[PDB]
Write a protein that binds this ligand. Structure first.
Ligand SMILES: Nc1ncnc2c1ncn2[C@@H]1O[C@H](COP(=O)(O)OP(=O)(O)OP(=O)(O)O)[C@@H](O)[C@H]1O
Ligand SMILES: COc1ccc(C)cc1-c1ccc(CN)cc1Cl
Length: 327
């Protein structure tokens, strides 16, 4: 069957720490007082929660309340444990409290509020310098959570809050996050379609932190090339074909051969034969201001089929693309 895989970094973090750290089912939730929070306006609703802007009436500060839907209410302890483990980490959203919502009768997570600049506004106006600056801030969050034995598994622009006025970034929505345990087979139905790593698309379950680095590369590619999303698949199968049209099919076959993966036979009639395209093919007069040889080299080192060959977050922080960013 498939050849096993393990991360090249932070493999022993969970075994080294006490069981109480990663054994989220044994965690006893410390409930706060729901009356401390007055809901102001509904910000959104997904398949897993309803999100509200609120006021913490004990200090009059703005907060965000995520009232979990019963479908999410099963794996609530995992999100809570991850948020508590990562609390205070660089660019990690702060979990301020956990309360029982009086209406839904489910847990409601209370987070610090971030005055998030419009996504269209950020996508359309971030300069070359700002992209480098914010990419470095995301890497601080990813290296922290990976160093803490956790993979986010849903890295995408909607999960990155940016308060552009205060040059403040937060990585949010830890609902899909998991503890990395070497040799564990994980569910491949994670991340959003356009950000799914090839490991997910070929059904390779023994993945790790490096899945987040692929998703980060997808964000960077869309941003520097002005191509939203970069890999625009119609479904999960066409998603791999879109990747193969850029990275080529030869390296895809080398990847599946290395891990002894057998592609779904439905790929035989859609994948075709494609060479790798040089990153400069995507440069044009409307994106040339965001592209540089350093940006292309950095992107090249993230967007690799082989999850073990991608830069780790800490290696990525060493890249020449960030030399211009003030530290
Ligand atoms: N800590 C926070 N501070 C401010 N706003 C937040 C915070 N956490 C979540 N939000 C906002 O809550 C809203 C809820 O929207 P929703 O649940 O539909 O997610 P989303 O951003 O649309 O992501 P997706 O693309 O997965 O739908 C979003 O507009 C998001 O920006
Ligand atoms: C493709 O987007 C991004 C790509 C790269 C970087 C550094 C940031 C972003 C980015 C992150 C969050 C938001 C707002 N939710 C908006 C944007 Cl444009």
């Amino acid at each position: 069957g498939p050849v096993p895989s393990r991360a090249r970094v932070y493999t022993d973090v969970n075994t080294h720490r006490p069981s109480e750290y990663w054994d989220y089912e044994s965690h006893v939730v410390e409930w706060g007082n729901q009356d401390d929070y007055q809901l102001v306006r509904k910000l959104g609703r997904g398949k897993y929660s309803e999100v509200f802007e609120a006021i913490n009436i004990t200090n009059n500060e703005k907060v965000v309340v995520k009232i979990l839907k019963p479908v999410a209410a099963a794996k609530i302890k995992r999100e809570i444990k991850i948020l508590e483990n990562l609390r205070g980490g660089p660019n990690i959203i702060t979990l301020a409290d956990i309360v029982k919502d009086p209406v839904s009768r489910t847990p409601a997570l209370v987070f610090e509020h971030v005055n998030n600049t419009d996504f269209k506004q950020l996508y359309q106006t971030l300069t070359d310098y700002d992209i480098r600056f914010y990419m470095y801030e995301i890497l601080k969050a990813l290296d922290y959570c990976h160093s803490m034995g956790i993979m986010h598994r849903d890295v995408k622009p909607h999960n990155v809050m940016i308060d552009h006025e205060h040059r403040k970034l937060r990585l949010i929505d830890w609902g899909l996050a998991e503890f990395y345990h070497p040799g564990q087979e994980y569910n491949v139905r994670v991340a959003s379609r356009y950000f799914k790593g090839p490991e997910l698309l070929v059904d390779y379950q023994m993945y790790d932190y490096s899945l987040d680095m692929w998703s980060l590369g997808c964000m960077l590619a869309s941003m520097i090339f002005r191509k939203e999303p970069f890999f625009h698949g119609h479904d999960n199968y066409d998603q791999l074909v879109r990747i193969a049209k850029v990275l080529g099919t030869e390296d895809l076959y080398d990847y599946i051969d290395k891990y002894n993966i057998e592609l779904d036979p439905r790929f035989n009639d859609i994948l075709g034969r494609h060479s790798r395209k040089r990153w400069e093919r995507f440069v044009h007069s409307e994106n040339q201001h965001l592209v540089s040889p350093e940006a292309l080299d950095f992107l090249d080192k993230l967007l690799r089929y082989d999850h073990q060959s991608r830069l780790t977050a800490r290696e990525a922080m060493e890249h020449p693309y960030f030399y211009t960013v003030v530290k």
